[PDB]
Design an enzyme around this catalytic site. Sequence first.
Site, PDB file in Angstrom:
ATOM      1  N   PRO A  97      -8.862   1.639   5.955  1.00 36.58           N
ATOM      2  CA  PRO A  97      -9.155   1.332   4.411  1.00 36.58           C
ATOM      3  C   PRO A  97      -9.695   2.701   3.423  1.00 36.58           C
ATOM      4  O   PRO A  97      -9.722   2.311   2.247  1.00 36.58           O
ATOM      5  CB  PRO A  97     -10.199   0.275   4.514  1.00 36.58           C
ATOM      6  N   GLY A  98      -9.945   3.771   3.949  1.00 33.44           N
ATOM      7  CA  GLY A  98     -10.331   4.683   2.840  1.00 33.44           C
ATOM      8  C   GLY A  98      -9.186   5.547   2.500  1.00 33.44           C
ATOM      9  O   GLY A  98      -9.358   6.310   1.652  1.00 33.44           O
ATOM     10  N   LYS A 112       0.360  16.637   6.082  1.00 36.81           N
ATOM     11  CA  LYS A 112       0.203  16.797   4.679  1.00 36.81           C
ATOM     12  C   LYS A 112      -0.813  15.658   4.356  1.00 36.81           C
ATOM     13  O   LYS A 112      -0.971  14.664   4.730  1.00 36.81           O
ATOM     14  CB  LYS A 112       1.492  16.754   3.753  1.00 36.81           C
ATOM     15  N   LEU A 154       0.936  -1.313  -0.064  1.00 41.23           N
ATOM     16  CA  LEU A 154      -0.154  -0.022  -0.042  1.00 41.23           C
ATOM     17  C   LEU A 154       0.917   1.209  -0.292  1.00 41.23           C
ATOM     18  O   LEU A 154       0.284   2.451  -0.113  1.00 41.23           O
ATOM     19  CB  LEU A 154      -0.971  -0.105   1.226  1.00 41.23           C
ATOM     20  N   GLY A 155       2.136   1.060   0.406  1.00 40.88           N
ATOM     21  CA  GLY A 155       2.932   2.337   0.449  1.00 40.88           C
ATOM     22  C   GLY A 155       4.378   1.860   0.192  1.00 40.88           C
ATOM     23  O   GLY A 155       4.654   0.784   0.492  1.00 40.88           O
ATOM     24  N   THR A 156       5.307   2.637  -0.205  1.00 40.74           N
ATOM     25  CA  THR A 156       6.808   2.402  -0.475  1.00 40.74           C
ATOM     26  C   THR A 156       7.600   3.453  -0.311  1.00 40.74           C
ATOM     27  O   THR A 156       7.150   4.796  -0.100  1.00 40.74           O
ATOM     28  CB  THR A 156       6.833   2.104  -1.800  1.00 40.74           C
ATOM     29  N   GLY A 157       8.956   3.359  -0.310  1.00 44.71           N
ATOM     30  CA  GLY A 157       9.633   4.260   0.179  1.00 44.71           C
ATOM     31  C   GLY A 157      11.287   3.868   0.807  1.00 44.71           C
ATOM     32  O   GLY A 157      11.523   2.906   0.444  1.00 44.71           O
ATOM     33  N   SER A 158      11.999   4.819   1.312  1.00 45.92           N
ATOM     34  CA  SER A 158      13.323   4.572   1.645  1.00 45.92           C
ATOM     35  C   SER A 158      12.998   3.916   3.138  1.00 45.92           C
ATOM     36  O   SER A 158      13.922   3.234   3.394  1.00 45.92           O
ATOM     37  CB  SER A 158      14.069   5.771   1.870  1.00 45.92           C
ATOM     38  N   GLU A 199      -1.341  13.558   1.900  1.00 51.61           N
ATOM     39  CA  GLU A 199      -0.628  12.185   1.746  1.00 51.61           C
ATOM     40  C   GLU A 199      -0.528  11.266   2.745  1.00 51.61           C
ATOM     41  O   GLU A 199      -0.363  10.180   2.992  1.00 51.61           O
ATOM     42  CB  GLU A 199       0.472  12.178   0.944  1.00 51.61           C
ATOM     43  N   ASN A 200      -0.569  12.362   4.137  1.00 51.34           N
ATOM     44  CA  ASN A 200      -0.028  11.503   5.497  1.00 51.34           C
ATOM     45  C   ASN A 200      -1.478  11.541   6.231  1.00 51.34           C
ATOM     46  O   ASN A 200      -1.482  10.833   7.380  1.00 51.34           O
ATOM     47  CB  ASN A 200       0.765  12.468   5.992  1.00 51.34           C
TER      48      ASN A 200
END
EC number: 2.7.11.11
Lengths: 336, 17
Positions: free
Chosen positions: A110-111, A154, A35-39, A156-157
């Site tokens: 879930p939203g 923000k 569901l999410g990705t990154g460093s 996205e957070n």
Amino acid sequence: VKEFLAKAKEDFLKKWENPAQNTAHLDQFERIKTLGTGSFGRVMLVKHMETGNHYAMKILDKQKVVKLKQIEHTLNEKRILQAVNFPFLVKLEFSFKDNSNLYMVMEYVPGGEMFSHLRRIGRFSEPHARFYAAQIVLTFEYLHSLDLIYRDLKPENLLIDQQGYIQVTDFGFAKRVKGRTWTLCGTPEYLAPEIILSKGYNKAVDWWALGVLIYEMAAGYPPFFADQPIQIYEKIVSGKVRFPSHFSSDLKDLLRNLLQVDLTKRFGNLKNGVNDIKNHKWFATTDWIAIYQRKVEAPFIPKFKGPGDTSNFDDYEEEEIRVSINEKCGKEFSEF
Amino acid sequence: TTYADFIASGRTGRRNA
């Protein structure tokens, strides 16, 4: 509130000084989709076998966290999260580690991102924006009372649960601090001048980030943006803003008080605290206790396509979850 | 227009920290 807050400070501290670790094993979770990705690593929608419940599991690679110099932040965010507790904060249900990574299993919201919804709908009405601001104002009042600074606010957070309520969950930039701190971190558009100017900043920044959020929600685009960070930073330090003609005078005056470059003038930072905000004309409509109680009706409610439906969710390359036969970074994470 | 400048900025997608 003070009464409420002083009882929570007590709750916070008990967990903060005597946290918890190794509350579960990986063998008892079924991975569903990223569901999410990154460093950091990667958040994953998971299913608890014996229960069938859905949780959002954040996996961090140990060696990588080390390499990137992220062991302090990594332990800090997991420490902060197993110790906070607020209606609008994502609980951490379990946490363990193996010979390879660290796992933080949180409550799955879930939203998804408020960002997705804001970019789709265009902008938000003031009442809808306010509904959310209200939930942020409370979550900062709380967080701030524990001498915690958030600094990572923000769209996205921000996640929206099924009831249509906002959920904060990422504490990577959170810092336990009574006075001032100096690090530069956050997202260019949400950075307060003082963070840009290399000044010692306090909890007032979180209030700048809110005026920005309330602005981007009602307008649809941030108060200061540009082609690149540097030109934004520039826009920001000028604290010069223009508002969409549809903005109410009240919504405008609140923002002039939140997006105040003069710290000695910033709302939530003055002598009367958050009440300068809680008591602003724009919030007349807001029923602060019902919001806390969740008795207010969301102006938007996700309608999931079943338990753990991730169709409205972007896809990502699923990487295998490998665990080394031999320990990895033991000592450095014994606190995890 | 601002909305117009916003699009041209190229920072209309998800922003990184």
